[PDB]
Structure 1
Amino acid sequence: MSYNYVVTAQKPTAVNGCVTGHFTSAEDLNLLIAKNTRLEIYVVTAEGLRPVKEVGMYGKIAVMELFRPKGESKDLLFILTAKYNACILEYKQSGESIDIITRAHGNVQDRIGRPSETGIIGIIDPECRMIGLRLYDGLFKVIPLDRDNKELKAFNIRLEELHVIDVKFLYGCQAPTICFVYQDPQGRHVKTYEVSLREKEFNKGPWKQENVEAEASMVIAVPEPFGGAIIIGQESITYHNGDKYLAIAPPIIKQSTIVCHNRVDPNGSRYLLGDMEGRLFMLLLEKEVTLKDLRVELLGETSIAECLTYLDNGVVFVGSRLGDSQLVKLNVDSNEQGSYVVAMETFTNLGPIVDMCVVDLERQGQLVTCSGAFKEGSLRIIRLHIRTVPLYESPRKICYQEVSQCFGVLSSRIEVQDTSGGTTALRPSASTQALSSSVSSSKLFGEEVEVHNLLIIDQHTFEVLHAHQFLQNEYALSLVSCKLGKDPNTYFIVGTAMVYPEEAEPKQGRIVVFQYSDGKLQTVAEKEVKGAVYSMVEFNGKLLASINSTVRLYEWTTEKELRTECNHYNNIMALYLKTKGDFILVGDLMRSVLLLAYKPMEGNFEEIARDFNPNWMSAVEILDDDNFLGAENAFNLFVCQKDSATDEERQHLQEVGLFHLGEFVNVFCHGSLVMQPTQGSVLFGTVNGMIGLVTSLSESWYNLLLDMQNRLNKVIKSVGKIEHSFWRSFHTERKTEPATGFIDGDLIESFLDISRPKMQEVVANLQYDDGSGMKREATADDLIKVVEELTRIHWSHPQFEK
């Protein structure tokens, strides 16, 4: 019913941060990887990475830094969460027990302020005196690192410059100095400040430089032997120091923007640069105590990287959000590129799951997902067993056709305009190697145009069988597989929009019906509509289409034609469109949920209820006839109900549930026997490569599980001492609210991990509502049985540690 159960099936795989240091012990080189609410610790050995610890955090990790104060034999870890929970963490090993100890914790949120455009920046000065955080525009926050600051008290200093791009701490200065790049109407400049802890202000810095490249975006702090800073821009690399200005404009970095860097040697002679296209660069600094020249050379191509880190000798870790993470070796030999990169290991990343479907329900359903973007695009088959089919282009939508035993996938690839006027591809992709190809109509600087294709992929071999290329400027948005009318044939139906750059609202679009027979794709029907087809669904033998703000229902005639039956006009754009029997759920991007019903006697659409509340909405799914589920702003889930206990109350969709998930959900699907006291099963796919499950519960079970969660919160020791209730609290701006109607399955499943004496104290004095009918004192074994039966609704997990 209203009460729901959310459990994580596949833990997030995207990498959003990585550091290297001496964390476990003074003699061990460690790699720390942050995934969403996930922290992984590895010991770096000659054979690869040795996993040691895996800890889950009650928040999204925004800042990770390793620092060593005076008197410490090993490094400490500083973590700051997107909800502004800060902690300093220590690693302790006592025999076989591995525990992460919290040294300090607190919340650094300010009651008034606007979050910065360029995000949260966290920096620790080299000598470990303070931590500098830039959370809101115009304010800089300092946390002293003296040993008695257990609660992390902080003070705010005023930056006179509002639009700050990057902040860094400098090396070699007697007093703590920061360097930053800021934008004003006069341009972009570089400025240095001095931070005084005793009087709490900003003093004037060693130097100030007006002339900075208009696209400067990154600041690199140089270690003590050289000092100063390096500013990385779209065109130039500049070294800035007192009476020291070196600048280069290498032609090899003009094609792409550098977004990441890492220091290779401790003396700062070598740096690694990474750009958005997947190229890897090495920046060389020449010395005599003083710097002479800067050189840039290209090492090779890797995955599209989010973070870089140099490990051991010649080993580099590439952490990717768009694709698989890689371990590469920096050989001196040039197989095809100077100092080419050799791949040695790959790590799975389900990445930005855009669309998914469930197939082969019998013996256990299977999940097929569209994952990755650009050259990282691939199809993932999940049973946890994962199979990867590389496509080398962006997959948008997927659907399954059982009669022809094939998958229909919409894709797109980027192509550049050649001087002759024709489009040319940068690399061979799946759409260019199809066995048979067809084009909608035969048609013919340096601008990138996006080409949309429909691909037919075999069920058994996943080879591409047919590729269909659409018209110029044509965008493919929706795809369904269904039977229409009295026709036994099964059709692929695709909805397109014609987008030209000189108009924002698409005036034209078309709906195309394809049939796959005899290994060839045939176009059966073609219909022109005045708008964009954002969504299409099958509605009891008729095609329901959303064209701009118009909801239209189409019949299938004997002459293979689409005929309009009924028309309903809204004041909102029907991006989301779900059906269940006679009900249609319509939702725009602004959370304005509308419920319509088709009455067959009169052949018209009628409005049952609605709920308008401005917020960014990512997906919706129909839970049952009365409950509807959606993804809110920030990272939240909500559920709304109809006909709750006048026509005013009937036309209102009352909210019932909020819950903070931490994930951005793109798609909902109905898969229940996919894994073989819950009702229904809904699976969702997130940007961070997370798969989760939602099931509905009853009165007694929801009450019992909520009571158990409250008891468990008192026994489970959190990392950083973050409260579970605060973490799961519904969070946007203008308000924060306690979670209602949602049971977090992860905390319930953690009940099986704790020791027996703690389990007894969790269960003690709980009045167990046994289904047999008499209420009695709960024993530990009864709750064990309930929790195990609950874990039997989702998949098993692979082993992490070694």
Structure 2
Amino acid sequence: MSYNYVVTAQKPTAVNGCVTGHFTSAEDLNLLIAKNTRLEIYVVTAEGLRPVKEVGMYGKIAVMELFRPKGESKDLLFILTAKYNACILEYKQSGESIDIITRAHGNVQDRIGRPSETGIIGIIDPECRMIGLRLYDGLFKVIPLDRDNKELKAFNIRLEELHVIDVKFLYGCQAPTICFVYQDPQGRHVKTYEVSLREKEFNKGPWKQENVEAEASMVIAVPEPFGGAIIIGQESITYHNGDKYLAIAPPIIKQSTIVCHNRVDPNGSRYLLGDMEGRLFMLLLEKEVTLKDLRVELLGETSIAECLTYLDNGVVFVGSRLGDSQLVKLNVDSNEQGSYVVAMETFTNLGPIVDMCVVDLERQGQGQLVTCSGAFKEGSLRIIRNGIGIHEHASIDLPGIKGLWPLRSDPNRETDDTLVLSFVGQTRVLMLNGEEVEETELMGFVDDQQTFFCGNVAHQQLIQITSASVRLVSQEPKALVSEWKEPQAKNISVASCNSSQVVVAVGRALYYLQIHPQELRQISHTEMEHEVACLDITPLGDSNGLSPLCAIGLWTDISARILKLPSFELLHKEMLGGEIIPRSILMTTFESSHYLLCALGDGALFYFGLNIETGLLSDRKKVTLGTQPTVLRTFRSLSTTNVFACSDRPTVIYSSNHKLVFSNVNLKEVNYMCPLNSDGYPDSLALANNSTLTIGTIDEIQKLHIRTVPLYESPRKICYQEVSQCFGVLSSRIEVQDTSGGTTALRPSASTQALSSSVSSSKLFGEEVEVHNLLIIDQHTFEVLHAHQFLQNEYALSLVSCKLGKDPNTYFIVGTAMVYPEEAEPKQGRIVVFQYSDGKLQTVAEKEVKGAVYSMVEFNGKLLASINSTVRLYEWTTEKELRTECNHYNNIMALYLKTKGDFILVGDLMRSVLLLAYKPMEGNFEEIARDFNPNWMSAVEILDDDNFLGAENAFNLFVCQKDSAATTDEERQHLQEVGLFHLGEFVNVFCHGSLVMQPTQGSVLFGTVNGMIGLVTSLSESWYNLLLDMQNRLNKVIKSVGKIEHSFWRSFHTERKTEPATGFIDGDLIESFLDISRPKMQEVVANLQYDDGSGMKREATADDLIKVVEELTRIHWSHPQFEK
């Protein structure tokens, strides 16, 4: 509404910068990586990268450079933010405490100035005399690196050349000297200037060269002994010094534009070069010592690279914004095989997220987010799920497993060496020696009866419970010593056992047995009102493995009565949920607390508190884990005990802060499970589905599990079609003009590799063409089931999955435009209705519109589409056609379309917002409100009936509102700005994903260019006010890197106007409350006002706000610890 809470669910993953040096220590080699608002610090090791320190800053990082002034023991780090916050940082380690010190800082923005086209360029001279900043056309800013300049005071030198492409400081010059490429009407040139330290002015440089390559775009300063500059253009690479000029134009670099570079060795012999398509090249300076020639070698293919950094041992870090970042190795077979690159590590990058969708939105099972991620060859679908991962160590193909039990054959050995499996009417035994598993026969155990329970028991004996009988077996003699049978020899319906006592149930009859050396005694017999469903004798509390309580489930009337042992007398009767019969009953102690767990066939879980002395319910709470019946088995994690729930969705049950967690396991399906602690698989577990036994160990920390589905082409839009178990993905691939009157693909990709294929028409230089497709993608295997190719020059823009009218089919519906380079505004396009069935995509209907179908939504069983400046409502008739019902002309292009109820939000790239209402009794739309506020808008969403969220230029969010404080029509038709917030990310998609990541109401997720994923949720006014005040107090206590003010960082920002944030709480700031010291928490909450429900505010304690903030942390996915 008017009070919103915005928090990060996934930190930005895209890399915008990478530098190497000695920041942590003079003897460490570091890799520093910039990820927008995050700085990652690694120590380069022979094995790879050791994460050492990650920090956030209150700014978008635009410059990141290491340097060493004279008298400094190790490197310092210069950062400039996009909002012109400048700082110098020092790494300080004291034992195991790591702090980023701010040595100098200040804001270096000029009050007037035109930001340059090539953007911010920051450079440091090789003598560390000064930082040079190119922020504005016409000016070069110099910040003296003198020790006294701790405010980073700077002076500006005028630069006649107003269109600078790139600039560097040269090496080997008597005075600081810049070298730069610029353009003017007479062409593109390169020039130098000396910086006069006394005059604070430019002096004529040592050399210049006019009319260089028209696309010269990159300057590289070559160190001594050669000095000079390398200039990279699109077809050529030149070298320049005072009296020296070299030029090469090798064919090998013809095809793509070089856009990044990196120096390999200190003397400049070799540079790495990356082009926009992932080619990696080596630039070699040949020495005859004089520079004689330049050579370029293609080393291989890498992810498209924004930044390249050579580390050591032939290892290069590839930073990618369009794809996954990588650690790559240059091979040593150069003499015989030539120079080649081999990937050694891949780092997840979700960016750009151009669209996403949520699956399993219901919170009974946590939902998953699927994102259209990357572009070109790096294009991919990313499936993100939060859960407990299991590391699989072994897989065994045994079908039909009905039970799993750990056993120790040798009494002397602590580790389990045997795994016993039950099958219908059969039991098998597996012997575990290290990682070797062999089927064997255990003497004294029957193989012709299904085993209900198998385990080690007191008196150094083993016990097997079968429907036929209860068997006690000696360990050292390895033979049967006793057996128990029902008096009529009836089968045992349900069985429960522990080290000392066994309770078994036949029909309604219940028998209590105790284990004695070489003996089994029937202590008690009982009858029940209803058929037994489940039994538990787990020995909770302090006893010699003795339980005085027996838990039973009754089939005729569902119930969980608890009986005394050996009294066999009910002490409590539990609530009956309904007809569904109880499947599993478990008694477990978490921490020092005691609870009773009951599972039902419907998959409902009821947990009731129990007291060992009284054994009556403490609380009745039902949690739905899965539709399938759940089985409960206790397992030990660390010193605590946890319960694993086997069902369609396997679940682990935790206990933190004396509460009951229910975390998901990242496994498809588990029917049975048992702990397994063997010499080869210590502290592990064994799982079984219908076909397979798996031995594995739990990750021990809930994490985000991301499945990458590579497409090798650009994903653009995605929708989930549940009834079909598939996703629809619009995609595009680049093809090049063929010599044979056609176009050919650059590589195979999802649209050329589909199981089945279709096309829109059978129709038949080096120019690129975009070819668009609809991909159908299986939601479980992610196979490309089908690919439909659109018409030539047809651009696919919008995608929906839905039902329309009275038709029970679900369709994929795509909106298009016909794009011709000559025609600026599209005059032709169509809406295509597809059906996916029989593994085929069928064109069910088609509608020709006279323009671009920018957006589409299903509206009340009808299709709402935006064509050019018009919004049109279509009805789906029983003849399977789209019939126009009505049509609304706007003075704006309806790029953004969102609906709630009968309301329609229409948006354009200029931030023009229009609210429309469909009038059913008029069969037409009515304009309710509008707001024109020129600014680039990238996405919009409806929060509720009166509030609308959008993202707009310079990385901001805004909320605007249909005011209820109005009686005039002019007031009602005018939207109130009520929310402004500098997010620092560019939003491409908003989507509602309620409780997917399960004080806050509602849930809007957004995906961004940098791969960051955020959540917006609503606050009441009382929570916003408490949280706004807590921010201002937190801001006086939290150490900001670079000493940037939070209020300044979050202020709404454009190049023309800067304004304080309002209507938004920074959840990332609020959550940092949990990390400050106890004294600091209490100064934060001193004089704070904790409005409890009563309306009477009282003084807040630290413990109040700890619980409040901890609860806020649970609304979203937790963030991974960077270092170890």
TM bucket by the smaller chain? over 0.9
Cα–Cα, structure 1 residues 11 and 548, in superposed 2: closer, same or farther, change >3 Å?
A: same
- Deviation at 1:723? 0.3
Q: 1:257 to 1:709 in 2, by over 3 A?
A: same
| Partner Cα separation in structure 1 for residue 1060 and residue 826 of structure 2 | 41
- Provide, for residues 263-302 of structure 1, a one-character-per-residue CA deviation record: whole Å limited to 9, x for no partner: 1111111111111111011111122331111111110010
Q: 1:211 to 1:554 in 2, by over 3 A?
A: closer
The SS at the match of 1:206 is coil
Deviations 1:442-497 (A, max 9, x none): 11121111111111101110101011011111010011111111111111111111
Following TM superposition, the consecutive aligned residue runs of length 4 or more in structure 1 with deviations greater than 6 angstroms are: 334-337
Whether 1:717 and 2:1023 are equivalent positions in the alignment is no
More divergent stretch after superposition (770-779 vs 213-222): 770-779
2:55 alignment partner in structure 1: 55
Structure 1 contact 258–276 (Cα < 8 Å) conserved: yes
Cα deviation for residue 335 of structure 1 reads 12
Question: Quick check: 1:557–1:563 contact (8 Å CA) kept in 2?
Answer: yes
Say if 2:1026 and 2:1089, in contact at 8 Å, map to a contact too. no
User: In structure 2, what is the Cα distance between the partners aligned to 1:790 and 1:213?
Assistant: 56
Q: 1:361, 1:616 → 2: CA distance?
A: 31
- Tell which structure's C-alpha radius of gyration is larger: 2
CA distance in 2, matches of 1:301, 1:388: 19
Kindly indicate whether residue 724 of structure 2 is the aligned counterpart of residue 404 of structure 1. Answer: yes
Tell me how large the CA RMSD over aligned residues is: 1.2
| Contact 1:323 1:351 (8 Å CA) reproduced | yes
> Which deviates more, 85-94 or 184-193?
184-193
SS of 2:1024's partner is helix
Contact 2:756 2:785 in 1 (8 A): yes
Q: Distance in 1 between matches of 2:178 and 2:874?
A: 64
User: What TM-score, normalized to structure 2?
Assistant: 0.71
CA distance 1:576–1:757, change in 2 (3 Å):
same
Per the TM alignment, residue 333 of structure 1 is displaced from its structure 2 partner at its CA by 2.4
In the alignment, structure 1 residue 520 sits paired with structure 2 residue 522: no
- Please state whether the residue corresponding to 2:205 is helix, strand or coil: strand
Q: Is the 8 A contact 1:298 1:338 kept in 2?
A: no
Give 2:914's aligned residue.
594
Contact 1:327 1:345 in 2 (8 A): yes
CA contact (8 A) 1:278 1:302 kept: yes
**Identity score, percent:** 100
Q: In terms of mean alpha carbon deviation, does 335-344 or 56-65 score higher?
A: 335-344
Do the aligned residues in 1 keep the contact of 2:995 with 2:1115 (CA within 8 Å)? Answer: no
Deviates more, 1:654-663 or 1:238-247: 238-247
State the 1:338 CA deviation: 3.0
CA contact (8 A) 1:270 1:283 kept: yes
Deviations 1:21-65, CA, capped at 9 Å, x for gaps: 011111100000000100000000011100000100000000011
- In 2, the alpha carbon distance for the partners of 1:691 and 1:218 equals 33
Bigger shift: residues 674-683 or 210-219: 210-219
* Structure 2 counterpart of 1:483: 803
User: What is the deviation of 1:675?
Assistant: 1.4
Q: 2:160 is paired with a residue of what secondary structure? A: coil
**Partner SS, residue 648 of structure 1:** helix
Shift in Å, 1:336: 11
In 1, the alpha carbon distance for the partners of 2:978 and 2:335 equals: 61
Q: Please tell me whether the aligned partners of residues 300 and 338 of structure 1 are also in contact (alpha carbons under 8 angstroms).
A: no
Provide the C-alpha distance between the structure 2 equivalents of 1:502 and 1:683, rounded to a whole number of angstroms.
Answer: 39
Cα-to-partner distance string for 1:113-143 (whole Å, 9 max, x where unaligned): 1100110010100011011000000001001
Cα deviation 1:602-658 (Å, max 9, x = unaligned): 111101010011111000000000000000111000001113381110110111010
Bigger drift between 333-342 and 59-68 goes to 333-342
Rounded Cα–Cα distance in structure 1 between residues aligned with 2:335 and 2:914: 59
User: Is contact 1:766-1:777 (8 Å) kept?
Assistant: yes
Say which SS state the counterpart of residue 707 (structure 1) adopts: helix
Greater CA drift, 288-297 or 79-88: 288-297
**CA distance, structure 1, for counterparts of residue 287 and residue 1076 of structure 2:** 57
Question: Which shows bigger deviation, 536-545 or 377-386?
Answer: 377-386
Cα offset for 1:558?
A: 1.1
Q: 1:119 to 1:337 in 2, by over 3 A?
A: farther
Task: Tell me how far 1:182 sits from its aligned partner.
Answer: 1.1
Residue 362 of structure 1 and its aligned partner are, at CA, apart by: 4.4
Partner SS state of residue 334, structure 2: coil
Match of 2:137 in 1: 137
SS in 1 for 2:83: coil
Aligned to 1:241: 241
Distance 1:741 1:618 in 2: 20
In the TM superposition, what whole-angstrom CA distance separates every residue of 1:418-446 from its partner, at most 9, and x where no partner exists? 11111111111011111111111111121
Name the CA distance, whole Å, in 2 between partners of 1:468 and 1:315: 41
Q: Which moved more, 1:530-539 or 1:638-647?
A: 638-647
Residue 240 of structure 1 deviates from its aligned partner by 0.6
Is the contact between residue 874 and residue 883 of structure 2 (CA under 8 Å) also seen in structure 1? yes
In 2, Cα distance between the equivalents of 1:493 and 1:214? Answer: 45
**Secondary structure in 2 aligned to 1:618?**
strand
Query: 5+ unaligned residues in a row in structure 2: which ranges?
Result: 385-702
Structure 1 residue 505: deviation in Å? Answer: 1.0
Q: Which runs of 5+ in 1 are unaligned?
A: none
SS in 1 for 2:172: coil
CA distance in 2, matches of 1:115, 1:479: 38
Separation in 1, partners of 2:987, 2:902:
26
Please give the per-residue CA displacement for 1:165-186, whole angstroms capped at 9, x wherever unaligned: 1111111111111111111111
C-alpha separation in 1, matches of 2:838 and 2:334: 47
Contact 1:328 1:341 in 2 (8 A): yes
Q: Number of residues paired by the alignment?
A: 802
Q: Do the aligned residues in 1 keep the contact of 2:256 with 2:275 (CA within 8 Å)? A: yes
Q: Contact 1:298–1:337 at 8 Å: present in 2 too?
A: no
In the TM superposition, 1:317-328 aligns within 5 A as 317-328=317-328
- Call closer, same or farther: CA 1:271–1:727 in 2, change over 3 Å: same
Distance across 2 between alignment mates of 1:496 and 1:211: 44
Structure 1 position 91, deviation (Å): 0.6
Equivalent residues of 2:41, 2:54 under 8 A apart: yes
Shift of 1:199: 1.3
Residue 799 of structure 1 deviates from its aligned partner by 2.7
Residue 733 (structure 1) shift: 2.1
Query: Which deviates more from structure 2 when the two are superposed, residues 212-221 or residues 573-582?
Result: 212-221
1:626/1:561 Cα in 2 relative to 1: closer, same or farther (>3 Å)? same
- Residue 366 of structure 1 corresponds to 368
Residue 336 to residue 37, structure 1, CA distance change in 2 (3 Å) = farther
Residues 46 and 313 of structure 2 are in contact (CA less than 8 Å); yes or no, is this contact kept in structure 1? no
Deviation digits for residues 212-256 of structure 1, max 9, x if unmatched?
122111111011111111111111111111111111111111111
Q: Structure 1 336/712 Cα, relative in aligned 2: closer, same or farther at 3 Å?
A: farther
Alpha-carbon distance in structure 1 between the residues aligned to 2:968 and 2:736: 61
Per-residue deviation at 1:360?
1.6
> For each residue in 1:704-749, what CA deviation from the matched residue of structure 2 results, as whole angstroms up to 9, or x when unmatched?
0001001110000100100000000000022110111100001100
2-structure distance, mates of 1:334, 1:580: 63
Distance 1:264 1:669 in 2: 44
Deviations 1:475-533 (A, max 9, x none): 10011111111111111111111111111111111111111111111111111111111
Indicate which of 894, 899, 908 corresponds to 1:574.
894
Partner SS, residue 54 of structure 1: strand
- Give yes or no for contact 1:437–1:467 (8 Å, CA) kept in 2: yes
Is 63-72 or 767-776 further displaced after alignment? Answer: 767-776
The separation in 2 between residues aligned to 1:133 and 1:643, in whole angstroms, is 46
CA distance, structure 2, for counterparts of residue 592 and residue 521 of structure 1: 37
Deviation for aligned residue 1:334: 6.4
Which 10-residue stretch deviates more, 389-398 or 335-344?
335-344
- Larger mean CA deviation between 57-66 and 500-509 belongs to 500-509
Residues 19 and 32, structure 1, Cα contact 8 Å, conserved in 2: yes
Alpha-carbon distance between aligned partners in 1 of 2:760 and 2:181, rounded to the nearest angstrom: 50
User: Aligned ranges for residues 377-396 of structure 1 at < 5 Å?
Assistant: 377-382=379-384, 384-396=704-716
Per the TM alignment, residue 149 of structure 1 is displaced from its structure 2 partner at its CA by: 0.5
Q: Is the 1:628–1:640 Cα contact (8 Å) retained in structure 2? A: yes
Q: What is the rounded CA distance, in whole Å, between the counterparts of 2:836 and 2:201 in structure 1?
A: 71
Distance in 1, matches of 2:826 and 2:1090, equals: 60
